Design a protein around this ligand. Sequence first.
Ligand SMILES: [Zn+2]
Ligand SMILES: [Zn+2]
Lengths: 194, 609, 261, 93
Amino acid sequence: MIMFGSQENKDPLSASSRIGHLLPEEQVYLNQQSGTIRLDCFTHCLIVKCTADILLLDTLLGTLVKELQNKYTPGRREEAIAVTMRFLRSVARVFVILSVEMASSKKKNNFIPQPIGKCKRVFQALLPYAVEELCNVAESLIVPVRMGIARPTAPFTLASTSIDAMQGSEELFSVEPLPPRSYLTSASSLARAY
Amino acid sequence: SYLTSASSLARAYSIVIRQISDLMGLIPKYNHLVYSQIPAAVKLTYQDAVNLQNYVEEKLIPTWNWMVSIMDSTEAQLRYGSALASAGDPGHPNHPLHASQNMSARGDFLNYALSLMRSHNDEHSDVLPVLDVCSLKHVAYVFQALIYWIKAMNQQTGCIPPNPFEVPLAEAIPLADQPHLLQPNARKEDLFHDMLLGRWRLSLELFGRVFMEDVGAEPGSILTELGGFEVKESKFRREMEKLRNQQSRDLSLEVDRDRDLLIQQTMRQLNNHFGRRCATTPMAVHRVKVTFKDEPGEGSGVARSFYTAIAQAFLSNEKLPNLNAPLFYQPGKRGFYTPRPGKNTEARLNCFRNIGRILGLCLLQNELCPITLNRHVIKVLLGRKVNWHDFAFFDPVMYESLRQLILASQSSDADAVFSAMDLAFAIDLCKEEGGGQVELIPNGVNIPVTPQNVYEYVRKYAEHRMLVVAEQPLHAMRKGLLDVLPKNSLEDLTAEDFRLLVNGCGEVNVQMLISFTSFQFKRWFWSIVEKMSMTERQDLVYFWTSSPSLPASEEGFQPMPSITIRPPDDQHLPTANTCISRLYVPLYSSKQILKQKLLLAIKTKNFGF
Amino acid sequence: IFECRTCGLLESLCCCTECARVCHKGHDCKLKRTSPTAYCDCWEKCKCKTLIAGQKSARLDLLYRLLTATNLVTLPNSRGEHLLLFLVQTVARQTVEHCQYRPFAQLALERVLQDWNALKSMIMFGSQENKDPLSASSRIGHLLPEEQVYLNQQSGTIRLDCFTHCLIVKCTADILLLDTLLGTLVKELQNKYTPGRREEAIAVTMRFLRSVARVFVILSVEMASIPQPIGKCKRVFQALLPYAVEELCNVAESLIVPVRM
Amino acid sequence: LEVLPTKMSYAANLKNVMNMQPPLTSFRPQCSFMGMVISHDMLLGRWRLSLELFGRVFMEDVGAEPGSILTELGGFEVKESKFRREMEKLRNQ
Ligand SMILES: [Zn+2]
Ligand SMILES: [Zn+2]
């Protein structure tokens, strides 16, 4: 599951040979990229769409932690870290989107939405690796505003209720990849994400 | 208002960078240019010259890193999108080439944020990255300036040659195989310092289309030089407009519609005009006017009818009045003609000479002259060096058949194979010339070709079929254009540009026609013209603007084509005013029957004013 | 034209700008912006002390001795302009008015630039240890210590820009003045006899080329894609090519920094 | 950061910031951003005027984030709001 996106199932990642290959440099750009749309769909469903049963998330973290401290099997430690790192990148992507959508606690309710609360549980149980991965995620968001990279976009309102936030998130995450054959708003919004 | 300030600061930066480059160009020639002319100037040694260069480079390094990283990132995104188009399929509305690419504010931003996080660890798969290249024009000012620095510092302290190593013609020169890919804006790839300019090929292609009015107005812009048809035709359209309006002497032509008399009348006046003039002095005219008799009315539409009328006389393959063979033929694909040498009489030279003028006259006043020419004959007209790649335009069959011969000569067994063919340096002429073996080199009949000189044999076949057989027409047809257009007005445009300006668009494009013409009746009219056959579109435009084709640019209509809807009347027929290219159609509340009036009007093939 | 309350020159009555600084010095004389067509009326209501011109040969000779014996060229006048700045304004104003003549400032200015002391004062006029009476600075003796710093840093450069702009843009006359300014600068930039002079001439040239680059950029940014004002800026850079390239390198760097960040 | 920021130039200022360069419960944080232990009080005192405009212009957007230092250094404008609303809620109770 986690190492999906790599290898070929149904997408232009598959059939990258002569049929989708005009001299070798076509594959070079098609390679060096690993799919994560399928991975993101699994993560978003497990964090957002599912209920507060909080048993599948514990079950997933139980086996990841168990293999992260396995020594008697040769080479198991290295593949456990690579699996963990890719999974934590997916959770950070969902957490950034969810937190950016929702507004600040202006009503002094002192309540954090359940989907975000599940994201924090993953980060805490994997503290050394989550801290490392959140460092790179933050760097990707603020690098365009360090220079004039722009992509101005347009201002948008901030959702106050949970239901509105779950609306926007699923539009961009429940998506099928592909088959085979105003500037100041963007800077301020990226700075808010950082 | 941020991007306006950032783009202005980038323009101010470029003005300073040019001065450093301009100043540093005077260092080698200081004692001859500055120290002598200026009464009071400093004296420069050599040690401070190299130290000065080190100072400039170290200052410009931070800007170099800023620009290169941005241009590298955008180029990889643009190239990756083109890779996805080839592999992905059309249809699914996220394909880059699908119709949609041509949403809530919240939804629009979340994709940009998601794209950046995915591309940091280079995941970015199966989705086209979000990129608003129209917002990077302050970057384009910086990059264009630093190129100017290194495009001139390199001097201070095309025509594809390869003959061998062939590839199938289907993707080697695709323009030759489908000659209908000549859109006015067709990308050059589809038809067919230095390292950095080629390293960012795609990025410099988008620049010069979105950033040409600003950037490209600068005194040393690469985008202006890198520009293709869109900037070169506008420059030419002004170039011969300047010489058209300055002239105060006009010429009058007078011919009839009859085929035999038309050629006789047209020649009888053209040579008379050259009699009072000189060969060295160009035949530049303010305006040449021709009126057909038995039909009163003078105007622009009459002139357009003439160029088509004179073209059909030479287009056809029948004989001509003696004052003897037809002077054109199609050796390769249909539509593209090559001169017929024939008996090489003095009268034939004038016929090929005088067809040159009408090509220049058409360009001078910017009509269309439907005399389609092969690539090689167009090239020799402009003066560019003919090579062994445009021979593919002469025909696809022979070069491809000849291409296998070099490819087969790459094996040792080909020596035994070559003994079977045992070709010699002799070529049999086509049935066009009446046949007959011709020697490529002296005593070539007794000398059989070998795989050793297949490299040598190939080039002797081409130019024998290219130049010498058509030596006197190509040398005669040339001063036809020469005597009317100046020497220094055609060097910029290539053989590919020349065709679009002379012959216009290859086919009558309805999708361009709608964007060119101006006015529920229209929708019925537009549906009719979509399905009506391709054979008689040329007549409709001939009915429309007295020409079978369309100009390759929107400006090519002087004035713009218009259509006016008259009050309803089912008895009358549509009438076109060619002098203003205005078509009047009665307001018909029916679609199928309206086509009958259009077909009836088209078949008339008559004009009157 | 000017108006004076004390002399009664009002309404239709006016006095020329030459009479304002001599006949009406110290009065309540102010410039007015009305009715551009006029003529002087100073004598009709005042004893005009400007109707007589003296011996011209003695005027120049007197200027020669004052520029040699005395140290008077460094002192600015009551309006804050050093003598060189005043003269350049006169030449620019004169060359427009004097074109309407139907049948000294040029000579003095071309002579003042020829000596090193005047050029040193003009180019470094706003710089510290040189104080403009009318500037908001040179009053820093009663403000808090933190206020006094933040003001020792930064150096006045408006007066230098005004002088440089006039000699390049406004003084559209002959080029003799611009070559004269460079002639004494380059000579003082290659003199090895007087000790402690090379490093001083280097600093003066740096400051001057900074003003030219500031003027050259604004003119080029304003204009669309060669005008004489730009051609004069280009000539200055060529004559001091080693010292112009490095100055332009910093000028370009300052413009692109906010875009880069 | 001992020297008072004096130059009003972005290029020079960026040069300065660059060229100047057991039981687990015993672990203690060690903020030393590019040398020297840094306290929020020192940074707040250094950027004083810049933080007065920030808390007075960007009060509805940047002054609304969780744990923002724009709203607990705020003046009357932020003080008149939370007291009256808190009083109003108590009054209606
Ligand atoms: Zn007075
Ligand atoms: Zn007077």
